[PDB]
Design a protein around this nucleic acid. Structure first.
Length: 77
DNA sequence: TGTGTCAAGTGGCTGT
DNA sequence: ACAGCCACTTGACACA
């Protein structure tokens, strides 16, 4: 047999409260790169699961750089 | 009506 | 073998 499995999974935009954001911003705006017992603790404060921290921290370090592609321009033939 | 945005989803080589 | 962000992209979400 081969296919994977019966899965049909569902990510609706799984948004953290501006507060939770703020602490995520906070922890980004301070720090690029977190060991779990730091970051879980943010996950603890704002009461998310630590990947939901991490993943908001992943989404920022690429997001920055792109912004900066703007600044000058997206100069590509 | 359609898309960007956001968060994942997903996928890719790098080193010990 | 080993661990997995980084960058693209879809998969739900705001908006003219």
């Amino acid at each position: 047999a081969s296919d994977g499995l019966p899965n049909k999974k569902r990510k609706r935009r799984v948004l953290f409260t501006k507060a939770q954001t703020y602490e995520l911003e906070r922890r980004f705006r301070q720090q690029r790169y977190l060991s779990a017992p730091e970051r879980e603790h943010l996950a603890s404060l704002i009461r998310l699961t630590p990947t939901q921290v991490k993943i908001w921290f992943q989404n920022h370090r690429y997001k920055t750089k792109r912004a900066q592609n703007e600044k000058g321009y997206e100069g590509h033939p």
